[model samples]
Target: KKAPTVSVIVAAFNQEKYIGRCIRSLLNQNFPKEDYEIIIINDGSTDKTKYALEIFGKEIKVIENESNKGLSASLNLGIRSALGQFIVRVDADDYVNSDYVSILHKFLSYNPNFDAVACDYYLVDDHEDFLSRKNCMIDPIGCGIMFRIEQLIDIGLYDDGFLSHEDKDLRIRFEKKYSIHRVELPLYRYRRH
Candidate 1:
């Protein structure tokens, strides 16, 4: 297959209920299928994540860890294996708009000065009922942000030292070196449940 322009990485750990939806959401992206590849990291999920990924078969790249290595480690593994110019992280428990890739791709494409771009999101419960809205710049999280692979590598990726709050740590370091433009549209659906 030809190289993809964007690589979407998803890390999962015991999130059987949500991982399926997350994977389907990414597969439903409006971006041209040939232009992107989905990389799923099954971080020692004891649930049915691996089985769910099997539904996709060779359509996606599946990396399974024998033991739970946490989010940062799984993410880094995906990052290292990515073969795209751009990279995006999607949590296993969340979903995104069909145009999430196209929108963020255009954002970074049109503005070369910016190293990354992000969008607003809707906060929803387990049933996907909207609870509230969150601005990417204000409530910065791992999802909703599209980054240049090179720039991301320069920031050293997510700190493996942090079990949580790795997003906050990356955001601080990222903002100091490069600009993160915000698209006000709610392209991400964050599950609070």
Candidate 2:
């Protein structure tokens, strides 16, 4: 198999209603197929999320947990399994624009000084209704940021101890070693409850 330049990881559990859109958006990315790979980690969802992933088939890499392993574990699993120079986290309920991968990858590729890069996002309601555009610096979230694989490994992956707030913890430790550059364009769609 050919190696990929980027990896997109989605940790999903019981997200049947929105998983399809998330995967669809990832597939719609304009980046060349050989340059990127999509990984979907199904974290033991009782819902039909597994079935939802079936349609993608061989297009994406799949990691299944027999029992619920929570977000951190599943994310770690995907990251370890990934074979890309850079990694991106995408929530099962969220989606992105066609340029999501291409734009982020280009930023990191051109600017070697940057260890990671993030893009603005449109905060949408559960119904997929557009709410407002959110800046990554002003209001940062876990997803929509692309990180260097080694930088992520150097800081150590997400802490599995916290039941929630893993993203906040990761960011704290991450900022200590490297900085995440921002793209003013709203390339991601975050589903806010």
Candidate 3:
């Protein structure tokens, strides 16, 4: 198999209603197919998230858990399984623009000074209707963020203890040790259900 430059990880739990669209969006990314791989971690979803993932078949690498593992653990598993230089976290309920991968990849690849990169997002209702555009400065949705694999490994990845604020926790640690840059473009659709 060909190696990929980016590994897009989608950690999902009971996201049957939205996982299909999310995975579809990732598969449709404008980034070169050979340059990117999609990893979907179905964390013991009681719902039909697994069935939804089956639609993609071999197009994605799936890690199915027999029991519920929280976001942090799922993400860490995906990160470890990833075979790419860059890693992106994509929530099962959210989708992204076609340029999402390409734009973020280019930003980090060209700007060597940046250790990580993030993009603004459109806050949307459960039906995927846009609520408003978020202006990212210090905090952005975890799904909208991208980082070099090694930098993420260096920070020791997400903290599995907290039920919330994992993003903030990572941001704090990442900012302390390396530079993070943001793209003003709203490349991700963040669903608030």
Candidate 4:
């Protein structure tokens, strides 16, 4: 309804097959329906991603780019358009547990000591089979870390200069000003493809 408390931004490229799995997992989050919003950025995918998005329809916001902008730019675009007080990134090919949002949101919403929060993730294969659970900070990526939107903006957002190493870049800059508290729950599925 009104401005949501959390905004889940997904930067999708040619991930046609796994996009729905990711979005559906988010939809199944154990959080209030209206309290969060899903924003999917269709970054000029030539695959069937466009058709796949139709299934979700109005359930998610779809932002499109005429040409395929790299991950950094797509993330920046999504963050700029975010309407929620908090924002988190979920890779198009990866999925999360039902409590992923609720747990992380509560950590930041209630705790004043934590500037940002991240959850541990399960390493899953392309078949979606469980491999192993690992800590987020042990090998931090872009996704699974949730932060106040203002903080992301104040840090200058994602650097588009790096198309691939964008996550590492953000991690460095983010930790420079804010400390990311870690949650031990393996609430995310990091797919290896």
Whole-model lDDT per candidate: 0.86, 0.89, 0.85, 0.87
| Candidate 3 residue 158 C-alpha distance from true site, Å | 7.4
Residue-by-residue lDDT tens digits, candidate 1, 1-193: 8899999999888888988888888889889989999999999988888789899998899999999988778888898899999998888899988999998999888889878888999998989898999887778877768899888767666556542555677688788889888899998999995
Model number with the top lDDT:
2
Local accuracy of candidate 2 as per-residue lDDT tens digits, 1-193: 7899999999999999999999999999889999999999999999999999998899888999999988778887888888998999998999999999999999999999999999999999878788999899999998878999888767756545432456777798889989999998999999987
Considering only N, C-alpha and C atoms within 3 Å, which residue pairs clash in candidate 2? Answer: none
| Error at 163, model 1, angstroms | 8.7
Score candidate 3 by lDDT.
0.85
Q: Model 3 over residues 1-193: C-alpha lDDT tens digits? A: 7999999988889999988889888999888899999999899999888889888899999999999978778877888899999988888889999999999999999989988888888888878788989876744666667889887767666555432456777678778888778898988898886
Better of 1 and 3 by lDDT: 1
Models 1 onward score TM values of 0.93, 0.95, 0.93, 0.94
Poorest lDDT segment (10 consecutive residues) of candidate 2: 156-165
Which of the two candidates, 1 or 2, achieves a greater TM-score against the reference? 2
Which prediction has more favorable lDDT, 1 or 4? 4
Model 3 TM: 0.93
TM-score, ranked from best to worst: 2, 4, 1, 3
